[model samples]
Target: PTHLSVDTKFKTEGLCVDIPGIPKDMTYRRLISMMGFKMNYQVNGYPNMFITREEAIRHVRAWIGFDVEGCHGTNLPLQLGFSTGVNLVAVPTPLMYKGLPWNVVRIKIVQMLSDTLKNLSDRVVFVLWAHGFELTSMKYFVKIGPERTCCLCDRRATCFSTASDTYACWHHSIGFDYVYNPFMIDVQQWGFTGNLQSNHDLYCQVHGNAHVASCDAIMTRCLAVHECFVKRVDWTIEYPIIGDELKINAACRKVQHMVVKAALLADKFPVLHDIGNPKAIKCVPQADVEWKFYDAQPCSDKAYKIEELFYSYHSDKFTDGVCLFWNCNVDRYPANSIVCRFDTRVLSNLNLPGCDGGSLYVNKHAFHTPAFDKSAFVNLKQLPFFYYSDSPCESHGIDYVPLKSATCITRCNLGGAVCRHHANEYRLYLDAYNMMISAGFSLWVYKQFDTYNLWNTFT
Candidate 1:
């Protein structure tokens, strides 16, 4: 009963928000309930992202697969990643996949969060952060086989880091390591030239025979040939337990999750400059989110804000991001009354955002449901630029506006939010820490044991 019990640290007065149905602790039942979805209400015309209680569950059914609708052992057509095994309790988080950029993947997740939040109560707590590494681009590279070949692991090459061994240890760097690589796996294969890097040797030849991607010994010239993609992946474990390790042709890239950091692959800047330098930025610089700006948001005033929040960011290069649309007639509606603090977080290297830089509160009178589009997503590439307007009007202050489409954004709606845009009346973030500054949030100074900063974490 005391799940809601609070220490004095939580006793503060800022925004009077409310949240219901959130679990007090991480229970198996609560965990299932918290794996929220960005529902496609209105026949895929609108996205209804929010949390709803799971139906009359008498027993434990944790291992059901990600396909909420296509369950009964039916899972999403996951093509990109893999895992040790697939059970209900723990499967990799459902990421965008095989080649899609993390941002595109994240847009999908953030869109889900926004959708799940649309009709949610103003006062709510995110019991769990559902959007995370279903299968990260990097983990996909670890698996091996002619079909899902390790794009880099064969020769056991001592040079290339793409090999499951080296890459796992390469500090989130390399062609396949998108989670932390500063470069774009969607653009420059880090160094791999052709599609999927035929074999370790062929790959090495193109990338200058460096250690490249071939660290594991799937074969001499053949593609990966096993069924194990990765187990005990080194990405998250503590020190003395460093590096990337996936069992190729393995885990079917189950429905598991952690913090799926929405990394950027837009700028093709100098990713190598920071390779050896332990003090360099491990995470690739992110581009701005490509959501429809306030100028021409698709949905009417009432329901459009939901769309704007869930899936405003998109990209010319990335895919799998969440989206919004106008399913009903183009009519106006009343504003919402309650406003909740929306936030997202992900460990790019591990797992996720805030307000002070810009304030976004839902006005029940001004609130709209979500969005509308033909398929599940909209073609944002056609839209010239991607801009995000925190408030209802564009003048609320455009906080982030990256130059390229590869740019994007993400957040964990776990509750902590501080919105204040440029010239914001609150002054919470008139200049506190924009995207660029926040980008340097120490690449997870918290883990202190992540692969990237493995050595530096020591005394």
Candidate 2:
């Protein structure tokens, strides 16, 4: 002391207190705790807090500033794997004391420690990342029916029914009748032949045949074209052209060919028969006007409000005479009986053809005859035998089997644990820490954080 020698050594050596200043620690702790506490309370108090796990994580990340880029820098590698070793434990310290009640503070501190440890642990992080990634990249496929099996018969028959007693080739059968099939050849290969010259000769032989046999010849010609012998081709190609214009054109031609072939076949094997006479045509009256029938000719009138005629186009009844009925004078009979038959006319000097200027009528008891026009009936037969050749490929029972696997290119930074790439490496770590802090603080914010509450005591 008397020499007043100055010693430059500055070691505290337990002389000074190890604890930080109350004001400084409190301020720092309060700042961090309040930030975390407020954020947690906001999230926990949300109406949709239990909506979903992914939603909860996203919400918590957004609330904290750690979601920003370059917050935690990079992760350090460990002997076992990569390690962030983030200071998540410090996140809970702030929630321990921040102007909160003793019980609330205690509860929050406990939860803070629990959540902090969970976030820091590599096991928990690995599980969370794996689960989240899997859920985000899942795809679903739906099957319309059983696969690799025929929809009809369930057997291995190649031919299927298009119409009653009519069978189409296996490909056409599967395409048109069954729900889906796997045996269909490509459209380009549909007509391919071993040799071009031989195919042409075969096509010529079949092409010159009648319409029924022309189908076989058409198939041969299609193959010849595909073999590259023909410079230009008319058949449809497998490759999908823009706007599906080529497909539509091909379909139209195919339908036209089928129609011509069907017409020819009908002429060859005529299935004509007398199916009986048409039914009577009933007429309703609207006004009281005396009607007439001249030579029983087929005629129509709109003078009376004749709304409809029942069985109007039946061929059996209206053969010899037209189904004629009229509305007569209301004063002559009851209102409901105003409808009457007009076969005869008044024999007076009215200057009319073979009758007077009075109501002309027909014989009500005349036999109902049949119309003998073969064309009308022939057209009706054609209506029932329609060939739907132009139906779209989609409607033709073609099965669309989606590819089983998919390829994805995901680019990420190589700084995190296990060399795992992340879009925002620093932000990811910071966010993880933030979530721990928030979850801890949420325990105290809500009154439910405390495991024990005041109980009634004897006074």
Candidate 3:
């Protein structure tokens, strides 16, 4: 009589294979070797197929999925999200506030990320949906300056001078160094063809958490784990890899300068400047436009891109012969704001007549309000300076005096006293100018925009 009995156990940690007939302990590699698995490879070769969910889970026990969400225009990170198969977290940066410098927000985010990433084991691989975008975010956190160079005995060449070498600059900036070179995997290169956000479509339909940063991270976890474990894809080639920090820093600055250079046209032209491409504004829908003020003018020393229509109204009315206030706050402005064209050089050069102080008052001190002179407020193409602000003439906290009817039309409001079409034109241009500067100035001021020493020739 031949006795044969087999027993198997399935547990969370792993599977159990028991064979009473075989005395010696059997490992997977040794068992496959003795069974002549190579023979099966020739007869019936392995095909690409998904393994069981349990098997895939075991394969990526130590792996983590990472992603970041950035502001719409400037690409400044607003959320950092990651998932460790079992645990997921999405951390929001400080609420983007008006009148706040970007560096303050940037540094705050970088430090938080540094602390979070440093807590993870260096041996664990970070899986990102698209390495190109995420890598840019990673490089954004790295410090840049004259000191980022390698500290070798000689500057020319050495065994330690390999391009993959991690220098002190990156180490100190992030608080830890990666000892292993192949620590990150860009899953998109590994056969996942969907956008990171699209992964949330199905999941969000049921759970209702789409558009959040954690949603993308969860999807990344699924794609990365399945690609790595169930499919058993070879990782010999590091397709989406993080390269030398110094090289990336230089590249980032180069792009930053290009964006700033493109923004120069915004003040003079009505075109939209998008880093490399500058597209002309054909038309903007009135529904898309909103009326709000930012913290800064185009040249406001208060801070970069502060939106406050009234502040600029003050400048447009009293300070200069021409209006220099940007119609919208370009940086950190509303996402809905659209860019229109403006010719700032022409507007500034125009020697528009100065305000006629005496003619504006209905009383000795009181100026016209929306209640009185409904005609001045109505049936006009553009908002007069009298209409743009509560007080256009009186500065230093006194009551306003309206501009003379002749000059006030063009000088006071963003839309000059002209056809209704002209109002839309200037409004669109101002909005476009703000959008361009948002892209340009946000990245331009890396550490800080030194208002004191900075020489803005446009002003």
Candidate 4:
């Protein structure tokens, strides 16, 4: 009872690399309907992040594993089932007969999906082996208009035809707004990595047989439960709660602008000399330093953006009041400024120029996401001048580039084997921040009760 050993051929080296059902060249009208290959869809250890076991279990009691059966081409739901524990609620609508009209079938399917979600409570976590087929059906069948502007979730900001293109489609199926929202879990993404096994595969491993809506639904429930309690998998952290694309894009743009301002601030004020004080604080001497000008350049378009989920939070106002933490250690040679932010609040300690020249205290929250403790330093900028050679600015295979001209010094190196040459220390740090921002970098500032900042006690 402790573990269900997964042994599927889909996990073979190259058998399921490309999905089965989807053709390579043909342009299907409703592509989402034909998008999944049961064995090839799961990506293991994806979103291998974390939320406490206590918080995840505290969020829900009942778990509803659902599945829908429909006409293959139309994706019109004819039968559906929701399973909880050993109980299965199988509901059949009008059959998908030869002469049945598409419009009527669509309406029936939408009504079925809508009514099912309507009956469920938020306290129940909706579990599915894979949500693609079920959700794509909802997107294909559901019509948006005056009466049904949004799904049961009432997420008006992001609920419509185009919404189907993203994880927002889940709102149409089960009234949840995000990809890995607390209200649901996809077992495909949980128990294994990179092999989307079928209900039969999962069912046979336990008690066997699968698929009429009720059969698959029961298998879904069993597999999900097996993964959760038996395997001890923390599904909450497997994937993060991603809101609509609208807000995500907005946040991405906001971060780019923040980086721009930070770049300017770092260059405007530089560290000239150290003030002989007990705190070892440095001073900015203006008389010794001189400002020089170069040829004016036009602004370049943004190179990076947040395209997927970064973290999870229960509130709809998750991004409403989000802010960034700017760390500008003005006492060092490479006076780098790092602007860190989190989806949640935490107690932060800024160790100034002592540990690694300036490091954020690696607190408990660092392990929540993959990028928290990753260092932003590269030796390209600060390395000794003798390390470079005139032969194509190469360093004899030592992963070093030369300081060729002022253009190389002033411009941002988009990162490669070459050195990141910047005009100033602040410019180098600014480029580092920009690179992280583009990579969707985040720090989980969720700390336990400590009185350093308002993040712990206040709102």
Q: Can you give the lDDT of residue 29 in candidate 3?
A: 32
In model 1, where do residues sit more than 4 Å from their true spots?
1-75, 78-164, 168-172, 177-352, 355-459
**C-alpha TM-scores of all predictions:** 0.15, 0.11, 0.24, 0.26
Report the error of model 3 at residue 22, Å.
59
lDDT-wise, the better of 1 and 2 is 2
- lDDT of each structure? 0.20, 0.21, 0.30, 0.31
Weakest 10 consecutive residues of candidate 3 by summed lDDT? 349-358
Write the candidate numbers in order of decreasing TM-score: 4, 3, 1, 2
> Could you report the Cα RMSD, in angstroms, for every candidate shown?
27.6, 44.9, 25.7, 22.4
Tens-digit lDDT track for model 4 on 176-199? 222222234445544454333353
Report the C-alpha lDDT of model 3 over 271-359, residue by residue, as the tens digit: 22121112212122221222122232122111133244324441232211111122222333222122221212111111110111101
Off-target runs (Cα >4 Å) in candidate 3 are 1-64, 73-80, 84-120, 131-133, 143-183, 197-208, 230-459
Question: lDDT tens string, model 2, 357-406?
Answer: 12111111111111111221211221211221111122211223321111
Sequence-dependent TM-score of model 1: 0.15
lDDT of 2 at 72: 18
Compared with the true structure, model 3 gives a TM-score of 0.24
lDDT per residue, candidate 1, 1-459, as tens digits?
212111111111111112333333433223222333222222321111112222101000110112111111122323321110111222233222243433344333223322322232111122211122221222322222111112244311111233353322121123332221111101111123333334334313312222212211112111211000011111121211011212210111110001111111221112111111122222222424333211232222223333433354623211223211112212221121001111112112110111111111121111111222222212122111112222221233135332221211111111123233322322222122233122221111111112222112122
